[PDB]
Amino acid sequence: YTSHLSSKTGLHFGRLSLRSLTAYAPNLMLWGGASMLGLFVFTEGWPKFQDTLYKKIPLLGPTLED
Amino acid sequence: LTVSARDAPTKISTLAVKVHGGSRYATKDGVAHLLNRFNFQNTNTRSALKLVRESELLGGTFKSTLDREYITLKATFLKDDLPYYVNALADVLYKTAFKPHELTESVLPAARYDYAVAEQCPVKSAEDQLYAITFRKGLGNPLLYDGVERVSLQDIKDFADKVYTKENLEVSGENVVEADLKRFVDESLLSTLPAGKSLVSKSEPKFFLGEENRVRFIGDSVAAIGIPVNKASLAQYEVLANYLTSALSELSGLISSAKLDKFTDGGLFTLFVRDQDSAVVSSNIKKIVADLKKGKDLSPAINYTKLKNAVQNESVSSPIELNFDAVKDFKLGKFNYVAVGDVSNLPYLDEL
Amino acid sequence: AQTHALSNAAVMDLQSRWENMPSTEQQDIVS
Amino acid sequence: AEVTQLSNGIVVATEHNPSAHTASVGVVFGSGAANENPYNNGVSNLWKNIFLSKENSAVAAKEGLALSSNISRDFQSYIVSSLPGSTDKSLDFLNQSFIQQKANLLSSSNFEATKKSVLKQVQDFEENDHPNRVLEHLHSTAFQNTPLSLPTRGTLESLENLVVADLESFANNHFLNSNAVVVGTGNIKHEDLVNSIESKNLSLQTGTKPVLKKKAAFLGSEVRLRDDTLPKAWISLAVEGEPVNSPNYFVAKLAAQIFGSYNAFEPASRLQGIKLLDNIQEYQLCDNFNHFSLSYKDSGLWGFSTATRNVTMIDDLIHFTLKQWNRLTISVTDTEVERAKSLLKLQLGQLYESGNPVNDANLLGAEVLIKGSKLSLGEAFKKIDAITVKDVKAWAGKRLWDQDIAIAGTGQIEGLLDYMRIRSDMSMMRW
């Protein structure tokens, strides 16, 4: 490169760069996915949440009858 | 400012600027080393690293060595990245900034570390003592800032303006096409540095022989010896140095080094003896000096010396082509001495 | 040539582990 | 200027280069420390030393030529340097005093003097050096019960228990013609191409090398020699690299050169660098780096060697280096990869094209035995620009992620936490 190499500066708010966020986007996306998965796991006794969970999974969780 | 280069099919290259200055030309003792460690940083034109880390990003590294009379600056690069490196090197060789508040933290700790790791080994101390006692306040000087005098930034700048100048300079690089460099220095600041004067020496430096020194270092004993050599007869000492240091002669399993440092118009034949104890050294050096003074035929090592000398050369600035044919004999005359480590057992100069 | 006192690391290696030796100098040492 | 190879009984190779003018001719035997059993260790060392002493005394006195050697794991690089116009004499001496005859060489007196000299040398190496010692220990602990862990120098117990017969037996079981070559790096063209094959100029002991029953393996371990007498500290991580002749040599070399060397007491190194170097430099943590990824024909080692000065702050240095390796295998900036490519290019250019013919000759011998043909650096440069972030991601997902490590250091290691504080934190639980 004779002589100037035509450097460009990437966007960054100090430490986080656009490259790092692009690399981490699916990671954080399914980390939020796993977080909500565990949230559904933790809650089972709410009649509202139990009612919501009953319909979406009807072939594994038909457990409401006395 | 005459330059030279050599063409190479290989696709790695390096350029060197050989400033004809260093310890010998330092007005104050501890300024050459500090200047050299002060060299590649904080140009006025571009920052210390914000525009020199791009050298590594671009495929090349920087180096600024030191010697007895060469402030050598080197840079190894690829073939297609030459003009930027020439411009950067000329910029650093432009006495640019020498910022005041960037010495008490930048280079002085580096100088102290370098001195500490270069003074533990008694070989270096023996070399320094031998040079100082043989050359006085001429060629010899302390190669390293030991802090004995306070040296001020004004003095550093004065030395830099004394040595860094267009006329007293030289540039050479290998694996670089000649035309590129021959027309690239002029397209750079190296055409604008003021023309000082060539600090070369017309005649041989004055030498002193016979005197000896001693110290009381804590460690392995070493018993250096030195000879003064002039340019008229310098082949004999080189061939003898290689004869000793090799395995050709029996004085091989006890000596540590017998190198011959080369100057413009002279040098010091040195040699060393070192051992863990403080009794083997005395007998070893006694027999070595006795046999050397006896006088040994030296011709059947010329081919070995020629091979080692030729293989030693790696730089474009080839030293003078020594004539290795007028070597017939040798007989030691007058010499010098330095003793380091313990002294109570090492022999004096009278009975050696 | 009828070596005498064949006392090298070979014999200790023989007594210690014979199976791990690579089946090639075995003939030499038995010879 | 192009390397030439053939196969006429004994492989002959040549890397012509009329740049330098120090002709070198020698042999590169494809065996060494890896090709020999634990009980008789320093046999190669003893060979090299008896040569390097008595043959040196012979050659210099007779003619002008300085002979060197080298043993790394499976070489005996008995390179015999010479002048450009003095190669025939060097070849004649080599074939008259190394292959045969060995009677004028292995006198009991010369052998015994060399034996005591070797003992003294290995002893003071054990008592003085330190980074080399921990590297040798790292090899000896990574490859337990395998003909690769034994060092290239040997142990005093193994050194003392061999006199003549073992030396001759190893000579006749490894100095054959099947796995021995000739290398002529320097400025010769084809005189070596024809003079090696002559009426009798040929190595004795026709046959084949005895094949090793087991080649190599790996397993995590520690060999620490904690002694507070020594001033500094020494550690050396390791992860199993990639063997030669594999489509992973150069990508591993780049994955090592990303982090790069570092010397904390240099004005021209602290300022440059990448994240770990800055985050170390804020405090005082370390004093040296050496990212090395060594490879051998059986298996290779990707290592990380330091020799610090601070003693209380070992854990933080290790933690930061591990998090940086995880960062390497999770996400790398494009500029980092480009800088690594450029640096590795220049490093290879310096290493393979150093003016000293001996280095080039040894490397050519290594490659010709292992690869089967020399890989000219032109192809290396052509195939190195193709290395891309996805490839390095993929390679690190295999060699690095949750793989057993081996460390071994001598000094004040005591501050170092034993195993589960340096192993189970290579993923940091959030990838």
User: D333–A19: do the CB atoms touch at under 8 Å?
Assistant: yes
User: A3–B87: do the CB atoms touch at under 8 Å?
Assistant: yes
Q: How far is A41 from chain B (nearest CA, A)?
A: 50
Q: How far is B97 from chain A (nearest CA, A)?
A: 23
User: Do residues D281 and D422 share a domain?
Assistant: yes
CA distance D144 to D218: 8
User: A2–B54: do the CB atoms touch at under 8 Å?
Assistant: no
Residue D353: its chain B contacts at CB < 8 A? Answer: 10, 12
Q: Which CATH architecture has domain B3-191?
A: 2-Layer Sandwich (3.30)
Q: Which two tokens stand for residue B107?
A: 């280079």
Burial class, B49, CB count within 10 angstroms (exposed 0-12 / middle 13-18 / buried 19+): middle
How many degrees, rounded to 5, is the angle at CA D386 between CA D381 and CA D390?
140
Asked which of D144, D176, D201 is the last residue of a domain, the reply is D201
What number of other Cβ atoms are within 10 A of residue B351's Cβ? Answer: 6
Q: Is the bond preceding residue C27 a cis peptide, omega within 30 degrees?
A: no
Q: State the DSSP code for A17.
A: B
User: What is the number of CB-based contacts under 8 A between chain B and chain D?
Assistant: 98
Question: By three-state DSSP, how is residue D302 classified?
Answer: strand
Strands B221-230 and B60-64, sheet pairing: unpaired
Q: Which two tokens stand for residue D412?
A: 């004040």
Could you tell me the residue ranges of all domains in chain B?
Answer: 3-191, 212-340
Which of D305, D288, D263 lies closest to D407, judged by CA? D305
Question: By three-state DSSP, how is residue D358 classified?
Answer: helix
State this model's resolution in angstroms: 3.2
Amino acid at residue number B348: Y
Strands B336-340 and B221-230, sheet pairing: antiparallel
User: Do residues D177 and D241 share a domain?
Assistant: no
Look-up: residue for tokens 């060092």?
A: D151
**Mutate: best of C2, C6, C8, C25, partner D, most D CBs <10 A:** C8
CA distance B204 to B202: 7
Determine the longest span between alpha carbons in chain B, in angstroms.
64
Identical fold for domains B3-191 and B212-340, yes or no, is yes
What are the φ and ψ backbone dihedral angles of D180, each rounded to 5 degrees? -130, 135
Which of C9, B308, B246 lies closest to D161, judged by CA? C9
User: Do residues D329 and D223 share a domain?
Assistant: yes
CA distance D65 to D59: 6
Q: How far is A9 from chain D (nearest CA, A)?
A: 11
Elucidation method:
cryo-EM
Q: Given CA atoms B241, B246, B251, B252 in this order, what sign does their dihedral have?
A: positive
In this complex, whether B and C touch, counting 3 or more CB pairs under 8 angstroms, is no
**Mutate: best of D333, D334, D345, partner A, most A CBs <10 A:** D333
Q: HSE (CB half, 13 Å, CA atoms) of D123? A: 10
User: Do residues D195 and D161 share a domain?
Assistant: yes
User: Do residues D411 and D305 share a domain?
Assistant: yes
Residue in chain A closest to B87 (alpha carbons) equals A3
Domain count, chain D: 2
**Mutate: best of D331, D333, D335, D338, partner A, most A CBs <10 A:** D331
Q: How far is A15 from chain D (nearest CA, A)?
A: 11
Asked which of D146, D176, D201 is the last residue of a domain, the reply is D201
- Cβ-count burial B67-96 (b if 16+ within 10 Å, e if not): bbbbbbbbbbbbeebbbbbbbbbbbbbbee
Helix (H) or strand (E) run with residue D28 in it: strand D24-29
Q: HSE (CB half, 13 Å, CA atoms) of B239? A: 24
User: Do residues D193 and D298 share a domain?
Assistant: no
Is residue D240 within 8 Å of residue D399, measured between CB atoms?
A: yes
Estimate the crossing angle of helix D334-352 against helix D249-257, to 10 degrees: 110
Question: Going by C-beta distance under 8 Å and a sequence separation of 6 or more, which residues neighbour residue C14?
Answer: C21, C29
User: B53–D271: do the CB atoms touch at under 8 Å?
Assistant: yes
User: Do residues D270 and D339 share a domain?
Assistant: yes
Mark which residues 59-98 of B lie under 8 Å from A by CB: 80-84, 87
Is residue D98 within 8 Å of residue D55, measured between CB atoms?
A: yes
Q: Per DSSP, what are the bridge partners of residue B60?
A: B77
Q: How far is D259 from chain B (nearest CA, A)?
A: 13
SS (H, E, C) chain B: CCEEEECCCCCCEEEEEEECCCCCCCCCHHHHHHHHHCCCCCCCCCCCCCCCHHHHHHCEEEEECCCCCCEEEEEEECCCCHHHHHHHHHHHCCCCCCCHHHCCCCCHHHHHHHHHHHHCCHHHHHHHHHHHHHHCCCCCCCCCCCCCCCCCHHHHHHHHHHHCCCCCCCEEEECCCHHHHHHHCCCCHHHCCCCCCCCCCCCCCCCCCCCEEECCCCCCEEEEEEEEEEHHHCHHHHHHHHHHHCCCCCCCCCECCCCEEECCCEEEEEECEEECCCCHHHHHHHHHHHHHHHCCCCCCCHHHHHHHHHHHCCCCCCCCCCCCCCCCCCCCCCCEEEEECCCCCCCCCCCC
User: Do residues D327 and D384 share a domain?
Assistant: yes
How many degrees, rounded to 5, is the angle at CA D137 between CA D136 and CA D138?
90
Residue D210: its chain C contacts at CB < 8 A? Answer: 22, 24-25
CA distance B270 to A27: 66
Q: How far is D18 from chain B (nearest CA, A)?
A: 10
CA distance D272 to B52: 9
Burial class, D319, CB count within 10 angstroms (exposed 0-12 / middle 13-18 / buried 19+): middle
CA distance D111 to D163: 8
Q: Per DSSP, what are the bridge partners of residue B174?
A: B6, B14
Residue D355: its chain B contacts at CB < 8 A? Answer: 314
Write the CATH number of the domain with boundaries B212-340: 3.30.830.10
Q: State the DSSP code for D53.
A: I
Look-up: residue for tokens 């030395």?
A: B159
Amino acid at residue number A17: S
Residue in chain B closest to D85 (alpha carbons) equals B307
Look-up: residue for tokens 């080649």?
A: D215
User: D267–B41: do the CB atoms touch at under 8 Å?
Assistant: yes
Residue in chain A closest to B86 (alpha carbons) equals A3
Residues of D with CB under 8 A from a CB of A: 330-331, 333-334, 430-431
User: Do residues D122 and D5 share a domain?
Assistant: yes
C-alpha to C-alpha distances, D114 to A34, B131, D160, D409, nearest whole angstrom:
68, 37, 12, 30
User: A3–B83: do the CB atoms touch at under 8 Å?
Assistant: yes
Residue in chain A closest to D334 (alpha carbons) equals A19
What does R_g of chain C's alpha carbons equal in angstroms?
A: 10
Segments forming the whole domain that contains residue D238: 208-431
CA distance B277 to B274: 9
In this complex, whether D and C touch, counting 3 or more CB pairs under 8 angstroms, is yes
Question: By three-state DSSP, how is residue D27 classified?
Answer: strand
Checking D68-71 for CB contacts under 8 A at 24+ apart, the result is D68/D358, D70/D362, D71/D32, D71/D33, D71/D44, D71/D45, D71/D152
Q: How far is C21 from chain D (nearest CA, A)?
A: 7
User: Do residues D161 and D278 share a domain?
Assistant: no
User: B80–A1: do the CB atoms touch at under 8 Å?
Assistant: yes
Asked which of D157, D186, D201 is the last residue of a domain, the reply is D201
State the DSSP string of D171-240. HHHHS-STTEEEE-TBT--SHHHHHSSSSS-S-S--S-PPPPS-------EE-----TTSSS--EEEEEE
